[PDB]
């Protein structure tokens, strides 16, 4: 109503509070909030004034509320609020305002920082992190829950990534947050840690030093897959680093935890579990043995033969990377073969894409080199593993890869057939 606008611009205190309340009410409906209409009335800048220092606290809370919902619309709608210079004021309210007020301010900031990597960075560059970390020294769960969510948006982003010198500062707080009883809070704290982990060795070392990984592992066995998903994503990001950084996670008992995740009813979880395992079998000889002793190979082989493609794909890597450490420990290869990975491996060539064919041929090749080195020692007439591959129908399929358009593949194929099947 136009009457509302008139009021909002009145010099009369009381009439202004009445208008901000009415305006905030229609942006809080249960249905489609008339955001554009409100913006069109040209009142946004007027609501931004009510968040200033001298303004009555009620008028500040109300105004911020309406403004937070206007900022929950499209990027176009969020820009109207950001272009009105509301951000710097939301930040001062985190310091001066009451708890109800802070609640509103951190919420508004959540929507702005969630619009784009630009706004995410803008909020960070307005130095919002200082006061935000202070919100966590309170006891009220609701406020801490919104601040945790907002913190999540600030850390999210890997295209232009957030300023590491700023976001890295939230680690200590996060470290505590992952022991919360509140599921919503708990969930968002994990996603935040996973965002800070998708970075360089420097970032991985920070998470490691604030002693997060051990807890992160205990969280893999939570009963809500809402906690399991972000926790697994961070754990997996860690084993991306060097051997030493990866040992910290093996030592935290992550392997026994992964054995369970392979049975997860959730498909994307089985996948990432294999992904993680594969970055650990990409490490040294000892780490490969650790995986073998944890008893992960058998279930891996099962998924290798019956999972969805996007999951088999990962199982393949895990098993293939393991075969590497076969040069050093010939038994690893023997174990792998004894567990029956040959047949499922050969069959994958038939439906795999070029990159997975290379990984499969490298594995089959390593498996073949060892079985050959044994023909020597044990003085065998034939290459045991070679005969195994012919059975599974592997030989025919390897032979077909000679007509693959990719040089790396057909060249690899001829060499295998020549060297081991003539």
């Amino acid at each position: 109503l136009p009457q509302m606008t008139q009021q909002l611009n009145s010099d009369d205190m009381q009439e202004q509070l009445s208008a901000t309340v009415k305006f905030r009410q229609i942006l809080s409906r249960e249905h489609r909030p008339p955001i554009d209409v409100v913006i069109q009335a040209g009142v946004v800048p007027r609501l931004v004034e009510f968040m200033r220092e001298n303004q009555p606290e009620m008028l500040q809370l109300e105004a911020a509320w309406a403004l937070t919902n206007i900022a929950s619309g499209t990027s176009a709608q969020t820009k109207v609020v950001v272009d009105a210079d509301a951000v710097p004021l939301f930040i001062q309210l985190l310091y001066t305002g009451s708890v109800e007020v802070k609640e509103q301010a951190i919420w508004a900031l959540g929507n702005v920082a969630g619009d784009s990597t630009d706004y995410r960075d803008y909020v960070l560059q307005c130095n919002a992190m200082e006061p935000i970390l202070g919100l966590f020294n309170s006891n009220k769960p609701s406020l801490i829950r919104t601040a945790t969510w907002t913190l999540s948006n600030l850390c999210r982003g890997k295209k232009p990534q957030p300023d590491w010198s700023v976001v890295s500062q939230a680690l200590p707080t996060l470290a505590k947050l992952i022991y919360s009883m509140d599921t919503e809070t708990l969930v968002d704290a994990c996603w935040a840690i996973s965002y800070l982990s998708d970075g360089p060795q420097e970032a991985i070392q920070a998470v490691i030093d604030v002693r997060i990984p051990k807890r992160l592992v205990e969280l893999l066995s939570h009963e809500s897959t809402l906690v399991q998903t972000p926790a697994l994503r961070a754990v997996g990001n860690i084993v991306t680093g060097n051997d030493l950084q990866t040992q910290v996670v093996i030592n935290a008992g992550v392997l026994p935890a992964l054995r369970l995740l392979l049975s997860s009813p959730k498909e994307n979880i089985k996948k990432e579990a294999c992904w993680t395992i594969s970055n650990i079998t990409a490490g040294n000889t000892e780490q490969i043995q650790a995986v073998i002793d944890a008893n992960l190979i058998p279930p891996l082989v099962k998924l290798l033969e019956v999972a969805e493609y996007k999951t088999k794909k990962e199982a393949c890597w895990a098993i293939s990377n393991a075969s590497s450490g076969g040069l050093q420990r010939p038994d690893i290869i023997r174990y792998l073969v004894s567990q029956g990975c040959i047949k499922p491996l050969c069959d994958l060539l038939e439906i795999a894409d070029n990159r997975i064919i290379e990984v499969t041929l490298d594995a089959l090749e390593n498996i073949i080199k060892m079985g050959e080195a044994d023909k020597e020692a044990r003085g065998l007439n034939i290459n045991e593993n070679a005969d195994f591959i012919e059975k599974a129908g592997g030989m025919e399929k390897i032979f077909n890869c000679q007509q693959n358009e990719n040089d790396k593949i057909y060249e690899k194929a001829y060499k295998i057939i020549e060297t081991y099947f003539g």
């Binding site: 809080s28 409906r29 249960e30 909030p33 509320w65 937070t68 919902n69 900022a71 929950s72 619309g73 969020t78 509103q104 919420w107 959540g110 929507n111 969630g114 619009d115 969510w149 948006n153």
Partner: peptide
């Protein structure tokens, strides 16, 4: 993501 206060 974004959230609306209801």
């Amino acid at each position: 993501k974004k959230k609306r206060k209801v």
